[PDB]
Amino acid sequence: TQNKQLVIDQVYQRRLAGDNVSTNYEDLPVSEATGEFKRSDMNNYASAKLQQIDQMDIPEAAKDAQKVALLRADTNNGPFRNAFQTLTQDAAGEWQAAVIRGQYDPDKMQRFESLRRAYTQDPSSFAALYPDQAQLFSTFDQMDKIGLDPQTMIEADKQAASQSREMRMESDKAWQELKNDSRNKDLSRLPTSLDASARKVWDSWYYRTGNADAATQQTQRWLNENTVTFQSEGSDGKSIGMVSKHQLMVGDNPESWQVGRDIIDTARKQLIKANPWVVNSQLSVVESIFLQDATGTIRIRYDKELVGKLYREQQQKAQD
Amino acid sequence: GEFRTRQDMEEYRHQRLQDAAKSYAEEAGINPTDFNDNITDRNIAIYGSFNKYFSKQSEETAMLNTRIEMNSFLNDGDLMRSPESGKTFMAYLRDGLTTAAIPSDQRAREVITQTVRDAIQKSGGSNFLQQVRGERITLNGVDATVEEIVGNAAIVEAQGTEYKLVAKYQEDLALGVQSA
């Protein structure tokens, strides 16, 4: 078993540096010091790695960054996604039991804290990967950003159950109305990826507070914090596109979304400068990421891995 | 490691023996006046262990005193800014080694590899490092240079300190003018 874990280690060590290695478990190099591979060998490795990381000698920020980085490099069939699914469901259950009991006990709320610790470093990939449990992320945001204590929320949740709101307006017709309104300008420009979390956040706010107007004020703040906006060059600045924040990350640094932005801006400026018929058109940025034209003739594509590799090579170019 | 004197250990041993003898005798009754088979072979081990622990503690105290004096040296300004600083350091090391103040040679290796690390966050650091680079001592028979004991990644930081200081001065000047 010990001599077998190392091949699976090498495959991922190569993956998280911009490569496709096709992590099947019937496509591994066989030998006489390992044997044969079954499905459970691809499931014990994740637990072994997650236990190994928490034994190192580095501060907590590095641990959280490394765990989320390992999650972000997986395909759709890896074990890390299953592990985090199980953890997420356990945390939700623990919170519900804490509400029912009516008191906050620091020795039984133990899976509610590890996920919270690992959630700070990247709060958009979580909301794009598990859209069915956006309720917990509202609690996390209210505990971190605003500043409420975790005991004054249980009482409010308990007292909200008696007077059930039930003022209708949750019928999937009101949401199309709510997005088409003239007054709401941030809600009209919305990426399709984050479209299924706005519903749950709005519903949670409405249920907790009662008002039907503070919900549409808190949702805009959440959305505006979790995206990036591009502006035009004219005197009257107009928006031309909204993209998510985890589509611009290059490395594993939790604040590396500040390089793709510069690359995209530079590319747009160069494209306008070098081609003397785009001025009458409206060069925009839709969400992969595409640079499109008004008529739909110019079309370019961008991706994380090539950008990261080229950036790394150019950085390592300048030497002695 | 709990005791610090022979007398405390002797009293502890006396009391424990006088208690355990009676307890074990009366567990099955017999008679306590009806334990003394090997005594030398136990006293020898006990006293050897005590002596070794005391030696270790004395060595540690000596190392602490050395650290305090080195830190007192490391804080002065016009000695480091002076062009003659390595000579004093080597003279101090030679005197300490010849008076047996430093207990061994590995301790000398530790202090030499630590002074270089410590002298980066100071003012007169680059001067000291550059003028202590090429001097030789004899350790464990083989002669070697101070550069060879370690093996150009500290010089850069030594310079970065003054770069930061100049930037701070520039910012302060800008603030003062804009306020005025």
């Binding site: 690359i263 530079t266 640079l291 370019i300 991706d303 080229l310 950036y311 | -």
Partner: protein
């Protein structure tokens, strides 16, 4: 000059084929070709839909008439309520 960002910017883009605007918005290859009969028009006339809501019905298949009629009626009812609320009446003041 290529060192700063220009090399990365040009060397990373990839070319793709151009879009087709007409197909993306309207999608006209799903439209069926059926000639409605007299009873199937009398049903629509008796239902009571206004002339501006025939867009949903056109192009459909004979099997799904009733659901489309229901959809048109629901849209009509929603617009009636919105107009009762007094929404599009601010144009009279100039």
């Amino acid at each position: 000059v290529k060192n700063s960002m220009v090399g990365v910017a040009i060397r990373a883009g990839q070319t793709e084929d151009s879009l087709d605007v007409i197909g993306d918005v309207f999608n006209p290859t799903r439209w069926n070709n059926h000639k409605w009969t007299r009873e199937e028009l009398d049903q629509i006339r008796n239902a009571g839909v206004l002339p501006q809501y025939y867009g949903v019905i056109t192009g459909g298949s004979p099997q799904n008439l009733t659901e489309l009629i229901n959809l048109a009626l629901e849209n009509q009812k929603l617009d009636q309520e919105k107009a009762k609320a007094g929404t599009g009446a601010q144009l009279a003041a100039g």
